[PDB]
Amino acid sequence: GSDDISKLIAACDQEPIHIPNAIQPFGAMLIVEKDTQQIVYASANSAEYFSVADNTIHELSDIKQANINSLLPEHLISGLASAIRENEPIWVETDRLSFLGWRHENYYIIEVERYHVQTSNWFEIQFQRAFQKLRNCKTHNDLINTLTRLIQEISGYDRVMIYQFDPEWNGRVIAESVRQLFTSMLNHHFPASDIPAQARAMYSINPIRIIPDVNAEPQPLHMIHKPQNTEAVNLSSGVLRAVSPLHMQYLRNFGVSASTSIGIFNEDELWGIVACHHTKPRAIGRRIRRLLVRTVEFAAERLWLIH
Amino acid sequence: GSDDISKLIAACDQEPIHIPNAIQPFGAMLIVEKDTQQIVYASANSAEYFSVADNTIHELSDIKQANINSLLPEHLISGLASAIRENEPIWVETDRLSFLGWRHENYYIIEVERYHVQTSNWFEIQFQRAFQKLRNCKTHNDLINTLTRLIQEISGYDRVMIYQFDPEWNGRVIAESVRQLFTSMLNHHFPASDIPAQARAMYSINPIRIIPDVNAEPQPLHMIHKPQNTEAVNLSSGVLRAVSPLHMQYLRNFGVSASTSIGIFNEDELWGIVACHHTKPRAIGRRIRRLLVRTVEFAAERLWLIH
Numbered sequence: 339g340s341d342d343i344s345k346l347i348a349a350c351d352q353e354p355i356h357i358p359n360a361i362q363p364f365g366a367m368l369i370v371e372k373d374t375q376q377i378v379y380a381s382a383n384s385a386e387y388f389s390v391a392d393n394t395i396h397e398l399s400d401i402k403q404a405n406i407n408s409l410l411p412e413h414l415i416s417g418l419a420s421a422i423r424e425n426e427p428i429w430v431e432t433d434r435l436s437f438l439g440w441r442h443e444n445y446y447i448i449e450v451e452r453y454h455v456q457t458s459n460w461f462e463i464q465f466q467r468a469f470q471k472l473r474n475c476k477t478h479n480d481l482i483n484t485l486t487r488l489i490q491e492i493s494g495y496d497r498v499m500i501y502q503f504d505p506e507w508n509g510r511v512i513a514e515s516v517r518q519l520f521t522s523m524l525n526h527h528f529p530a531s532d533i534p535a536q537a538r539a540m541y542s543i544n545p546i547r548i549i550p551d552v553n554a555e556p557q558p559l560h561m562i563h564k565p566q567n568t569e570a571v572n573l574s575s576g577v578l579r580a581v582s583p584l585h586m587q588y589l590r591n592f593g594v595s596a597s598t599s600i601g602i603f604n605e606d607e608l609w610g611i612v613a614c615h616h617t618k619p620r621a622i623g624r625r626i627r628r629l630l631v632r633t634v635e636f637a638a639e640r641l642w643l644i645h
Numbered sequence: 646g647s648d649d650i651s652k653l654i655a656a657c658d659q660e661p662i663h664i665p666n667a668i669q670p671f672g673a674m675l676i677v678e679k680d681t682q683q684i685v686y687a688s689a690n691s692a693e694y695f696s697v698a699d700n701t702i703h704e705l706s707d708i709k710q711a712n713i714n715s716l717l718p719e720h721l722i723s724g725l726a727s728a729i730r731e732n733e734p735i736w737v738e739t740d741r742l743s744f745l746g747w748r749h750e751n752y753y754i755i756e757v758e759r760y761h762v763q764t765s766n767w768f769e770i771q772f773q774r775a776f777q778k779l780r781n782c783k784t785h786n787d788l789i790n791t792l793t794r795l796i797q798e799i800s801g802y803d804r805v806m807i808y809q810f811d812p813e814w815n816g817r818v819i820a821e822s823v824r825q826l827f828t829s830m831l832n833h834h835f836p837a838s839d840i841p842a843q844a845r846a847m848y849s850i851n852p853i854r855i856i857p858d859v860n861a862e863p864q865p866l867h868m869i870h871k872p873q874n875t876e877a878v879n880l881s882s883g884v885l886r887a888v889s890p891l892h893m894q895y896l897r898n899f900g901v902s903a904s905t906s907i908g909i910f911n912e913d914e915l916w917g918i919v920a921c922h923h924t925k926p927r928a929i930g931r932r933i934r935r936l937l938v939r940t941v942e943f944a945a946e947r948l949w950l951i952h
């Protein structure tokens with residue numbers, strides 16, 4: 339509704355996007371308290387994923403009476419127990435599920451996605467091709483164009499752009515790589531207000547941001563066993579963190595059903611964003627995400643060498 | 646259909662958009678031979694429209710056995726017969742249907758749409774408001790921005806832009822009026838090749854162009870009785886003329902499900918276009934079309950005085 343959209347825009351610059359208390363439904367999330375060893379939150383769709391690891395779970399309510407050792411891999415639990423630095427995700431795979439868990443304050447946060455084993459030399463070949471091509475770039479402009487062409491080759495997204503920020507955080511589209519029959523966004527300007535400060539902040543917590551489907555219903559976090567601290571839990575280090583309905587609408591209005599964005603960092607400063615938009619919904623596996631982030635990180639070093 | 650898309654792009658500048666031998670499905674079309682008063686062409690969906698005029702019609706095969714006096718209002722036929730000028734459309738309404746027919750070459754062409762009687766002063770109020778506001782404009786910039794705001798208020802479309810052509814027919818977006826959560830298209834350039842010559846030509850035959858749903862399937866014109874001339878019939882004087890699948894795909898990739906464009910003319914030269922895009926499909930009645938075209942016509946006259 340128009341008035342609800344207006345009210346969202348009223349408080350949008352201050353919206354707490356790190357604590358949506360909901361997730362995107364392409365995975366499930368558990369939140370466990372470190373000291374009480376108890377599940378304190380579960381995403382609404384937790385049943386349809388964790389039934390694969392423990393066949394005794396049928397509804398969301400069964401999780402309260404479920405045992406963590408039945409839901410998570412033994413390796414993931416022991417890795418969370420001995421990991422001492424905060425917000426460093428541990429990635430553990432089984433035959434059917436793909437877990438990503440980290441330690442944040444007094445909690446363990448576990449995301450899980452479905453996973454399909456893919457055995458091929460394709461990633462090693464793509465990695466070598468990407469690096470040699472980026473090493474050959476000797477001019478600033480040639481590098482960003484090669485990077486945008488490579489990101490498109492790897493992910494298959496319909497349009498891939500690079501935003502560069504100016505000192506005052508306004509964005510300009512400095513290079514583009516798009517399929518035919520698309521409006522050219524090259525040299526488009528957008529104001530700093532379009533990306534709130536806290537939205538830029540997330541790229542320093544997790545350098546990739548993933549929206550596989552702008553029209554999937556966000557799943558909220560249900561309380562399971564009562565926590566000692568009831569403040570909402572920061573979800574920013576993982577990938578399932580739900581998207582602001584505002585931005586989902588913005589993406590719809592542009593004809594975009596799926597997006598993936600990657601931060602470009604010069605030292606610790608955020609210099610720009612690599613953004614990928616797709617007209618149809620689109621899922622990218624964890625390995626493809628890694629390949630994109632590694633390619634962008636390699637490109638950044640060469641870029642600073644060139645300037 | 647990527648490969649087929651590429652082959653269509655190959656021949657796009659040469660594509661004959663005036664003779665698509667198909668129509669958009671928000672109406673039905675008959676093409677009748679002038680001398681024999683015989684239906685030589687009918688759009689495939691004619692049944693669901695003319696069933697309202699003769700309920701003994703259920704499907705297209707009934708039209709082959711039909712006589713036009715059974716399908717059309719008698720005054721419309723006598724008006725087409727007695728008219729002496731070509732391509733000047735006659736507009737005839739019944740309680741349930743709205744016909745637009747004209748005289749073209751060897752035939753009488755008739756479009757028919759569904760129609761619902763709506764009784765209110767809304768149109769007179771909008772008309773008065775538009776004229777008084779457009780009369781207050783004292784500068785070129787004031788006029789284009791007021792016009793874009795007014796066209797948006799009248800049609801309710803999500804985005805309304807004004808393209809201005811330069812001497813070599815490249816387009817620049819000089820003014821825009823768009824809802825919140827939309828990428829600003831202000832000052833966007835597009836090359837002359839993006840609007841082929843035959844498409845600009847159409848605005849001189851009919852100043853409004855209407856696409857109420859980019860995802861509706863074009864309905865082809867079927868031969869009924871063999872005509873004396875087998876050359877394709879120019880459909881450009883009406884509004885049902887089917888849209889190039891190329892442009893429909895272009896609009897999808899831009900997030901547009903419905904579009905309406907209106908030509909801005911300085912004497913008979915085409916000076917620009919007023920374009921309306923909507924994220925979801927949208928239908929505009931014949932009265933709304935007349936109001937949009939008259940408002941643009943009034944704005945243009947004020948513009949030439951202003952410069």
Ligand SMILES: *C/C=C1/C(=C/c2[nH]c(/C=C3[NH+]=C(/C=C4/NC(=O)C(C=C)=C4C)C(C)=C\3CCC(=O)O)c(CCC(=O)O)c2C)NC(=O)[C@H]1C
Pocket residue numbers: 347350351355523527528531532533534537547580581582584585588597599611613826828829
């Ligand atoms: C007041 C708050 C607003 C807001 C919030 C918001 N935006 C993002 C992410 C965006 N939004 C971008 C906007 C654009 N402007 C343009 O001109 C174009 C052109 C293609 C775009 C895309 C933008 C560039 C980003 C970052 C990268 C991206 O392209 O996705 C977020 C983050 C969403 C999240 O939770 O991940 C928020 C909260 N957007 C506004 O426009 C104003 C209203």
Ligand SMILES: *C/C=C1/C(=C/c2[nH]c(/C=C3[NH+]=C(/C=C4/NC(=O)C(C=C)=C4C)C(C)=C\3CCC(=O)O)c(CCC(=O)O)c2C)NC(=O)[C@H]1C
Pocket residue numbers: 519521522654657658662808830833834835838839840841844854887888889891892895904906918920
């Ligand atoms: C080689 C032929 C091509 C083609 C054909 C084509 N275009 C139109 C109508 C258009 N197309 C427009 C394209 C744009 N360029 C931009 O930068 C933007 C930005 C928003 C747009 C929309 C355009 C402005 C018009 C006229 C206005 C409108 O919105 O309709 C047609 C006519 C369609 C019809 O009614 O039959 C045709 C045939 N489009 C191409 O992109 C190239 C491939």
Ligand SMILES: [Cl-]
Pocket residue numbers: 438577624627
């Ligand atoms: Cl990940």
Ligand SMILES: [Cl-]
Pocket residue numbers: 745884931934
């Ligand atoms: Cl009409």
